[PDB]
Design a protein around this ligand. Structure first.
Ligand code: SF4
Ligand code: SF4
Ligand code: SF4
Ligand code: SF4
Ligand code: FES
Ligand SMILES: [Zn+2]
Lengths: 117, 84, 688, 38, 114, 208, 71, 123, 107
């Protein structure tokens, strides 16, 4: 149940599990989330901007315990330490990529812990 | 010019302006029957010191400030700026 | 006198004999839960949520529809009432799907602010959940009819205020539905105003659909200016962008309703907007430049001009602070010759105590009228909520309405009395009946529209209608004070414009060839370069580029109406100031400060700097404009009705046809209505 | 499915540094002037 | 006013107190300018002292001036000793700040009326 | 009623209804309101004329020891026509009892401080000066604790906004670390959270 | 205008897109009235929701489910 | 005692920097977010100050800003102490008015008529 | 957890099935609880002292004033009495006996 790097998950063959229900935003204590949504032309709503202020992020992890469709996951990898302040502000196209550098690391920890919570 | 326009102010109560409320009964129907060119103005309520304005000469204000007149004092004060 | 002390939870209060238990318990500062009830609607009872246990009775009654007898003990909190408010709001929370991640009323639904406070803790159902299908009605009402807890609230609104008989109830028992049986679209005036009434998130807005949740907005109250009756709105920002509006529910006008046009006209507000000063370049070329290029360009031209060579027009939607800095500039140079866009005939009066120029009856005094006669206008497709007050005051008592000229589709039982201008002359005599009833009424009401008055016989019908109007006033008049003759408008910045002392109707610019003009008209194309002399410059000052910015010399960016602390005048003379919610984009500035900034680069400099100092100047001309939201009792037109008798211009011969079409004229109206892609999206859906 | 080949790195400039940017739309859509003739 | 004062009674125990510590500042301005090892001219310091006292001269009520006396005296506690390490004394002078325009034509080219 | 509801008791609700009653009986000079909390707490509302002697009466007795000064706090309340609210909290050592002293005041009106009565108020009393400006009387050393040296705000009241005005920055223009007007990278988006429909029946206001 | 901040920084960008990846799914069919969608597995994924499939043989991906569902 | 009764309108200053004379406050009633019908959020006067510019922060598009106050709402009790707080610190303001609606006359049973017009159908 | 679920969130296997679970889940994170008014106070044994919290409640999801008392206010103002008459090398040996931690003197 160790916390760490943020990442986003998706369904079997890619679906963007996020539904942009904004609940992770309203419980972030540092307001590191900022989301602008829009009806995509297919009809189902998705995201346009998606931000995690990894500077401001105080790691209360409540985003992991607030999503109903279980989208955002604190991925257990402490690999970090870049060289600018201008880099750690994660946009969306880090996070889906960062959520897809691995999934079997993530998908086994949820599946061993979801019975408790 | 002189002049451009004049602005009548009054009040619906505080009965010092009853001379003006009489003046419309006396000289508004005949006062504008003569000179059908000058666009004189009437507004609603100053509620204290119902002044009477005049404005002309590259936009210069001229305010005669009636407080509480009689029915002829409002009739004679108007022709001072009107003839000039 | 005429009361019963009823001990609401053992505490006395005196109501009228014949009110409701709901209004009794709401008077002492309590809320019983409300689903099948609305104050601005009729009363049904088919949700059965208000259930109070009355004392000295084993049964439970509902507070919606029953009177109150001799003084009871309305036991609000009991050990049985909470066995009822838990009871009913366990059933209807079962046959319902698991939305609200995605339900767009997700921060204000009444299954979500009742269900924490009242009601149970868990569920025991435990499978079921019927699922009906949805459809589409118009391109405005996003439609999920699954949720639809059948509170019969949208259904009665078709028989209520909006008189379109379109909806119904299709089905029996568990399976009934709400939507129209056939695929007939539903769109008229007020047709987008149902999505406030639907108490759950089954109905919502189509353009707003998937944007943002309602706990992030900043509610700042303001006023809309797209009609002459004003509005009572509330905007909501996100990051300095406008999201949506809702009606602010003022009790005189905008009761719980709002104009259907103004609801979705905000789209073009941020669509096609000019942001920056664009230089002349000598051909039809027009490119941007420094803000301190085109100021000194026109500053030397001002001192070269003198006399009637320079003029201006203004008939759009601008405030009453930039219509004084213009006036204190062009009359400090002492060269007035200035007018508006709208065609209002002036023969005897209008500028001088104005005597009829506002809507004389209050909107609150409309319901006390008994016989209404109106000519020469379409009340449905200009001032839409005006017909809503007629519709409601046609109901709930007797009200008699006749009409002269061009039968259009009004909702209620009107009748075409006739169509000629000679009808207006013959009603001073005794002919074409009702004949006496306008005199033999107790609160008569005679309304003139500005669309027929725009014609060339305007000064003729101005004295023809007021002939029989004072004839009723010299009769009794009513009892009574009861001002009868009144008039309407359809441009917001006209009554505010004229009572500053402007002349109405384009005649002074229609006679001379002036050199430089100021455009605040501006899209109303009654003045072109065709009626102008040769290629001397005309300066545009505004916010959009529909008509008059291509035909221009130097354009000026400016804030529209949602960016400045403005001040407007309704059709009765109130002042309902708008306030700043979003600061304007580009290099545009506030439209009175630019004139003082243009004054200081010119010779003459105006003696007021801040917006308070503007209002000190606004005190000088007219003192009713700082009198907020009051209509004083002042008519004084015994004399002014006699003075228009000096003019005896005769009528014309033409059927009194309004510009308003079946529906289509309602959409493309002002400036933003043309620029809004939303109105263009729906107007192609009507002609199809 | 949608997973990478081998791995990557969290390096400072490889030359690549991910250089995070803005991902929205222009809102006001400023007006276009008409063309060169009058 | 049903309220007891702090030190003064009416305006005459007051106005002799604002004159009083003015001399304590006046011998302090040459004393600290070689102490905190900063380099301006010393007369600028004496101008800024009387700058501060003269600006608040629009008071016609006691115990507010007396409230500023407690504020004015507490300034000297850090000042006579060394409790402001070469920054807080420099904080009095808006030195590297860009100038405010304060002119109507100058405000109009830059800013949405700040 | 059930499990998972706090079991209240009546013994401590009895004696604390008993003990504090004859406190107002024996000093009807300063006491203006006494109330018993529904969970064994006591408030003794005192006009601040008797700021010293009532404490001095609770300083020593044979039926009330109360020599453990725990908590001096300060609570502002706008819309009261006398804003602030100094609230003590003291402890009886021999008796295991808590009682608070609520004394209102205003801004400019001083308060006779508790310096001879208690010597634990040495750093607590100065804090209200630094944060509000409530000038206590006759304190031997009034100074500046827990704030920076150049503030003029007394920040813990309500008109002081969330950030100050004093966002600090460095430049190499000469050596200095200079002040500047405040500039944020983000609004601190302020929400709107108060749901309607009045979840509480007991605290219902007088309906006017 | 903004194109100068990444010179020698190579613009690390995403490769796949879920803008349109629903459309490559074998759109399901049942021939019934109302179906559960606990897709992705039980107790994970999107919550249970019931859809009427009578009208142009489809459901509409349930919003939540995302997978094209029909008959 | 040293009571020394005197009179002055209490205008306090020195605690802010310059925004006394610059801004103008506003006292009004929040009135019924009309997506629903809960009337608990009446009965309390609030305040809000002037709104100034919100630009774009050219790295993300965040709503970074100047205008240092911009978020200050207090909870007042009534109209009486509404004015008395704006004058006690002393900057300019402007006051709205509380709107309470009609009582009003609503009665079921008159929705079934013999000759009247108040008659519902299709229920 | 506490079972009545106006305070505790419901379980994860519950907030994906029933209707009653989400409305008492989705609302419980937008706003918080519903706390009654009336002042309160308590303290417990911190391992270096008492721990005063005078939590003023107002009646909404957002609390009013929350003043804390931590040790070190008493435990270090009384360094004046404790120190004098002694050396300078004594003074550093004094401080590590009271066990004073900063950031905790922020009360
Ligand atoms: S984790 Fe939840 S709240 Fe956050 S973006 Fe995804 S669906 Fe929305
Ligand atoms: S990780 Fe922590 S700081 Fe970031 S959104 Fe989640 S709870 Fe907030
Ligand atoms: S739209 Fe839905 S909630 Fe509204 S009345 Fe119809 S069924 Fe009821
Ligand atoms: S409308 Fe009501 S029941 Fe439907 S999703 Fe929203 S809160 Fe839930
Ligand atoms: S509330 Fe409408 S019937 Fe009970
Ligand atoms: Zn599914």
């Amino acid at each position: 149940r160790f916390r760490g790097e943020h990442a986003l998950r998706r369904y079997p063959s890619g679906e963007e599990r996020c539904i942009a229900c904004k609940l992770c935003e309203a419980v972030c204590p540092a307001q590191a989330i900022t989301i602008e949504a829009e009806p995509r032309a297919d009809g189902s709503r998705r995201t346009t901007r998606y931000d995690i202020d990894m500077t401001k992020c105080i790691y209360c992890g409540f985003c992991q315990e607030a999503c109903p469709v279980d989208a955002i996951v604190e991925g257990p990898n402490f690999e970090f330490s870049t060289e600018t302040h201008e880099e750690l502000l994660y946009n969306k196209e880090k996070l889906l990529n960062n959520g897809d550098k691995w999934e079997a690391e993530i998908a086994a920890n949820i599946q061993a812990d979801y019975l408790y919570r | 010019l002189g002049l451009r326009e004049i602005r009548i102010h009054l009040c619906q109560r505080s009965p010092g302006s009853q001379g003006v409320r009489d003046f419309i009964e006396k000289r508004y129907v005949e006062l504008k029957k003569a000179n059908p060119d000058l666009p004189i103005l009437i507004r609603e309520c100053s509620d204290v010191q119902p002044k009477l304005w005049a404005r002309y000469a590259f936009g210069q204000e001229k305010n005669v400030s009636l407080n509480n007149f009689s029915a002829d004092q409002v009739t004679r004060a108007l022709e001072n700026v009107l003839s000039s | 006198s005429n009361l019963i002390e009823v001990f609401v939870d053992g505490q006395s209060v005196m109501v009228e004999p014949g009110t409701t238990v709901l209004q009794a318990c709401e008077k002492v500062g309590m809320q019983i839960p409300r689903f099948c009830y609305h104050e601005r609607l009729s009363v049904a009872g088919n949700c059965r949520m208000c259930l109070v246990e009355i004392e000295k009775a084993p049964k439970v009654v509902a507070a919606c529809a029953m009177p109150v007898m001799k003084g009871w003990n309305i036991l609000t909190n009991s050990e049985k009432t909470k066995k009822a408010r838990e009871g009913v709001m366990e059933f209807l929370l079962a046959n319902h799907p698991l939305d609200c991640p995605i339900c767009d009323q997700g921060g204000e639904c009444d299954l979500q602010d009742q269900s924490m406070m009242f009601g149970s803790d868990r569920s025991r159902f435990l499978e079921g959940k019927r699922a009906v299908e949805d459809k589409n009605i118009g391109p405005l009402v996003k439609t999920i009819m699954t949720r639809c807890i059948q509170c019969t609230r949208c259904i009665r609104f078709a028989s209520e205020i909006a008189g379109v008989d379109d909806l119904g109830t299709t089905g029996r028992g568990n399976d009934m539905q709400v939507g129209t049986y056939i695929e007939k679209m539903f769109m008229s005036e007020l047709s987008g105003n149902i999505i406030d009434i639907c108490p759950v998130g089954a109905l919502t807005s189509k353009p707003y659909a998937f944007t943002a949740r309602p706990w992030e907005t900043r509610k700042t109250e303001s006023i809309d200016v797209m009609d002459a009756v004003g509005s009572n709105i509330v905007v909501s920002t996100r990051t300095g962008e406008v999201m949506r509006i809702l009606p602010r529910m003022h009790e005189d006008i905008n009761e719980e309703w709002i104009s259907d046009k103004t609801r979705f006209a905000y789209d073009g507000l941020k669509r096609q907007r000019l942001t920056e000063p664009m230089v002349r370049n000598e051909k039809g070329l027009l490119t941007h430049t420094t803000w301190e290029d085109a100021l000194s360009r026109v500053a030397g031209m001002l001192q070269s001009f003198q006399g009637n060579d320079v003029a201006a027009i203004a008939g759009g939607l601008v405030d009453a602070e930039a219509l004084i800095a213009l006036k204190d500039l062009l009359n400090r140079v002492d060269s007035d010759t200035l007018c508006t866009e709208e065609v209002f005939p002036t023969a005897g009066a209008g500028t001088d105590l104005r005597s009829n120029y506002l809507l004389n009856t209050t909107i609150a005094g409309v319901e006390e009228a008994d016989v209404v006669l109106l000519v020469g206008t379409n009340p449905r497709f200009e001032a839409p909520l005006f017909n809503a007050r007629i519709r409601k005051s046609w109901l709930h008592n007797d009200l008699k309405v006749a009409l002269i000229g061009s039968p259009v589709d009004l909702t209620y039982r009107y009748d075409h009395l006739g169509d000629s201008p000679k009808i207006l002359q013959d009603i001073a005599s005794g002919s074409h009946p009702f004949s006496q009833v306008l005199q033999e009424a107790k609160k008569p009401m005679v309304i003139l529209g500005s669309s027929a008055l725009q014609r060339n016989d305007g000064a003729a019908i101005l004295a023809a209608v007021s002939n029989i109007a004072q004839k009723i006033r010299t009769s009794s008049g009513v009892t009574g004070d009861w001002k009868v003759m009144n008039i309407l408008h359809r441009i917001a910045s006209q009554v505010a414009a004229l009572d500053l002392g402007y002349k109405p109707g384009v005649e002074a610019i229609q006679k001379n060839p002036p050199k430089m003009l100021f455009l605040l008209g501006a899209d109303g194309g009654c003045i072109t370069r065709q009626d102008l002399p040769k290629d001397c410059f005309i300066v545009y000052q505004g916010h959009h580029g529909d008509v008059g910015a291509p035909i221009a010399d130097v354009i000026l960016p400016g804030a529209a109406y949602t960016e400045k602390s403005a001040t407007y005048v309704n059709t009765e003379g109130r002042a309902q100031q708008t306030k700043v919610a979003v600061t304007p984009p580009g290099l545009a500035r506030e439209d009175w400060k630019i004139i003082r900034a243009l004054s200081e680069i010119a010779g003459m400099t105006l003696p007021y700097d801040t917006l308070d100092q503007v209002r000190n100047r606004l005190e000088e001309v007219s003192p009713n404009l700082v009198r907020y939201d009051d209509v004083e009792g002042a008519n004084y037109f015994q004399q002014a009705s006699e003075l228009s008798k000096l003019v005896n211009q005769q009528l014309l011969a033409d059927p009194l046809v309004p510009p308003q079409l079946t529906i289509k004229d309602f959409y493309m109206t002002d400036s933003i209505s043309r620029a809004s892609q939303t109105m263009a999206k729906c107007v192609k859906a009507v002609t199809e | 499915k949608f997973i990478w080949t081998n791995h990557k790195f969290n390096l400072s400039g490889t030359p690549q540094q991910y250089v995070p940017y803005s991902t929205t739309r222009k809102k006001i859509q400023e007006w276009v002037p008409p063309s060169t003739p009058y | 006013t049903s309220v007891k004062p702090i030190f003064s009674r009416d305006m005459n125990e007051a106005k002799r107190r604002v004159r009083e510590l003015y001399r304590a500042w006046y011998r302090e301005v040459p004393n600290t300018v070689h102490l905190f090892q900063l380099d301006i001219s010393v007369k600028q310091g004496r101008d800024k002292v009387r700058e501060m006292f003269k600006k608040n001269a629009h008071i016609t009520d006691p115990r507010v001036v007396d409230l500023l006396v407690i504020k004015g005296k507490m300034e000297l506690e850090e000042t006579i000793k060394v409790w402001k390490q070469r920054t807080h004394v420099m904080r009095f002078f808006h030195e590297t700040e860009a100038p405010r325009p304060k002119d109507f034509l100058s405000k109009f080219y830059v800013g949405h009326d700040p | 009623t059930r499990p998972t509801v706090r079991p209240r008791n009546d013994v401590a609700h009895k004696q604390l209804s008993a003990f504090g009653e004859y406190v107002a009986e024996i000093l009807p000079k300063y006491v203006q309101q006494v109330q018993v909390s529904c969970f064994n707490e006591l408030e003794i509302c005192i006009h601040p004329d008797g700021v010293i002697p009532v404490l001095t009466f609770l300083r020593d007795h044979s039926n009330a020891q109360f020599k453990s000064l725990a908590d001096l706090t300060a609570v502002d309340i706008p819309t009261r026509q006398n804003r602030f609210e100094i609230v003590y909290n003291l402890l009886s050592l021999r008796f295991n009892s808590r009682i608070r002293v609520k004394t209102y005041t205003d801004e400019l009106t001083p308060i006779e401080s508790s310096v001879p009565v208690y010597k634990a108020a040495n750093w607590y009393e100065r804090e209200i000066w630094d944060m509000f400006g409530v000038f206590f009387a006759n304190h031997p050393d009034l100074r500046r604790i827990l704030t920076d040296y150049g503030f003029e705000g007394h920040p813990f009241r309500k008109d002081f906004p969330l950030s100050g005005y004093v966002e600090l920055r460095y430049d190499d223009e000469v050596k200095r670390v200079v002040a500047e007007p405040v500039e944020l990278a983000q609004e601190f988006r302020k929400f709107d959270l108060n749901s309607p429909w009045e979840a509480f029946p007991a605290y219902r206001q007088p309906p006017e | 205008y903004r194109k100068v901040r990444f010179v020698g920084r190579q613009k690390e960008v995403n490769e796949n897109f879920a803008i349109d990846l629903i459309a490559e799914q074998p759109v399901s069919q049942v021939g019934s009235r109302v179906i559960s969608c606990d897709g992705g597995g039980g107790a994970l994924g999107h919550p249970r929701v019931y859809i009427n499939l009578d009208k142009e043989t489809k459901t509409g991906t349930c919003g939540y489910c995302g997978l094209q569902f029909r008959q | 005692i040293t009571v020394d009764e005197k009179l002055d309108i209490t205008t306090i200053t020195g605690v802010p920097e310059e925004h006394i004379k610059t801004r103008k406050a506003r006292i009004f009633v929040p009135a019924r977010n009309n997506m629903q019908s809960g009337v608990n959020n009446t009965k309390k006067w609030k305040m809000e100050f002037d709104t100034r510019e919100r630009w774009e922060n050219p790295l993300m598009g965040w709503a970074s800003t100047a205008d240092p106050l911009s978020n200050l709402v207090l909870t007042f009790s009534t109209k009486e102490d509404a004015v008395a707080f704006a004058e006690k610190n002393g900057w300019s303001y402007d006051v709205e008015e509380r709107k309470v609606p009609k009582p009003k006359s609503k009665s079921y049973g008159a929705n079934f008529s013999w000759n009247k017009r108040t008659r519902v159908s299709t229920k | 957890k506490v079972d009545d679920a106006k305070v505790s969130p419901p379980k994860r296997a519950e907030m994906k099935t029933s209707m009653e679970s989400l409305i008492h889940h989705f609302k419980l994170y937008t706003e918080g609880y519903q706390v009654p008014p009336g002042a309160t106070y308590t303290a417990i044994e911190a391992p270096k002292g008492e721990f005063g919290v005078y939590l003023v409640s107002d009646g909404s999801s957002r609390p009013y004033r929350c003043k804390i008392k931590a040790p070190g206010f008493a435990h270090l103002a009384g360094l004046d009495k404790m120190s004098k008459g002694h050396m300078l090398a004594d003074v550093v040996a004094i401080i590590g006996t009271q066990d004073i931690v900063f950031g905790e003197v922020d009360r």
